[PDB]
Design a protein around this ligand. Structure first.
Ligand SMILES: NC(=O)c1cn([C@@H](CO)CCc2cccc3ccccc23)cn1
Ligand SMILES: [Zn+2]
Length: 349
């Protein structure tokens, strides 16, 4: 069974797509919000996907469930805690977990998310709670954990507060900024609010990844690298449709954060074609394997490794390879990075 039963590193998994069904149901029931079902298994079966969906039908799923967690202090911290726990069961020794703090708040945020009424959990406060839970789960479960705060493509007005938050909470546990949501929104890599937040991220030494090339063209990747200056790419698949861009990103050792099982379910990769990650293997690309959203995809990190093992021929040596590349591409301090790698190279012999 477990396709690679060695320690792992994971760089691309959203907190808000990594919540236990039973906990959604717990706070639902407690706060009165109500959800398409009431068992874990039935709710799991509704939230989860086995087929690609339109964008509204994907985001709808966040409309059911998020109101159970958003705006409640204790829920925010618990989700962060229990995430750490899950990763511990996948055999991860280092993970960077991301989310938008505005999406879990119910005050000082406009528009207020998910139909929520106004309350008094701010977005700053959300980062603080998340930090707590993640630093407790690290202490308890033995996985080292950092986080990344996501700007939202359709809301550049939030972005300078993201980067200010990454600066306030830096190392502690936040190490980087991301740009998530709908990458197909015309012009959205270039909205001034996002460009100025990632230029402030450069100025203040906050690391940067951006989702690009998932469903968006190669030009969206090119904007992420050349104008937002990103250091890593979320998926990056469609880079392959620009050959000189592909070649240059290999020459600069850019890291590609691949989510093979997510890409099948979303329809990002059409199942009747060469998956991009096999090209990346054949090419010796610097890339990682990741879950993206285990809740929505009905997955664990072994799902993705079984997919690449069983469907695409991937070997132990390649699994060891890309984990090491993930550690090398982490946003940890230099010292902590060398320490991670020392750990891994040791487990791997
Ligand atoms: N797989 C993903 O794209 C994704 C994004 N998120 C959260 C933040 O961690 C944002 C969810 C969301 C909110 C509003 C608009 C969206 C548009 C597209 C995708 C996600 C959106 C979780 N999973
Ligand atoms: Zn993602």
């Amino acid at each position: 069974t477990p396709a690679f039963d060695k320690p792992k590193v994971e760089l691309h998994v959203h907190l808000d797509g990594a919540i236990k069904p039973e906990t959604i149901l717990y706070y639902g029931k407690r706060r009165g919000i109500a959800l398409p079902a009431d068992t874990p298994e039935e709710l799991q079966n509704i939230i989860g996907m086995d087929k690609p969906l339109t964008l509204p039908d994907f985001l709808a799923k966040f409309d059911y469930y998020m109101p159970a967690i958003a705006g409640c202090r204790d829920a925010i911290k618990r989700i962060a805690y229990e995430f750490v726990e899950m990763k511990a069961k996948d055999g991860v020794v280092y993970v960077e977990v991301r989310y938008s703090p505005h999406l879990l708040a119910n005050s000082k945020v406009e528009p207020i998310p998910w139909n929520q009424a106004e309350g008094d959990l701010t977005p700053d406060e959300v980062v603080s709670l998340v930090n707590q839970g993640l630093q407790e789960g690290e202490r308890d479960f033995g996985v080292k954990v950092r986080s990344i705060l996501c700007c939202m493509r359709h809301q550049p007005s939030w972005s300078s507060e993201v980067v200010e938050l990454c600066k306030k909470y830096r190392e502690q546990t936040v190490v980087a900024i991301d740009l998530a949501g709908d990458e197909t929104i015309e012009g959205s890599s270039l909205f001034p609010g996002h460009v100025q937040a990632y230029a402030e991220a450069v100025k203040s030494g906050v690391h940067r990844t951006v989702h690009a090339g998932e469903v968006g063209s190669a030009n969206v990747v090119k904007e992420a690298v050349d104008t937002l200056k990103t250091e890593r790419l979320g998926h990056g698949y469609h880079t392959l449709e620009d050959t000189t861009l592909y070649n240059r990103l290999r020459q600069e050792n850019m890291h590609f954060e691949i989510c093979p099982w997510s890409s099948y379910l979303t329809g990002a990769w059409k199942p009747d074609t060469e998956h991009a990650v096999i090209r990346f293997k054949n090419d010796q690309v610097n890339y990682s394997l990741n879950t993206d959203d285990p809740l929505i995809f009905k997955s664990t990190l072994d799902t993705d490794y079984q997919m690449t093992k069983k469907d695409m021929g991937f070997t132990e040596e390649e699994f060891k390879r890309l984990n090491i590349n993930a550690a090398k591409s982490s946003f940890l301090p230099e010292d902590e990075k060398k320490e991670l790698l020392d750990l891994l190279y040791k487990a791997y012999r």
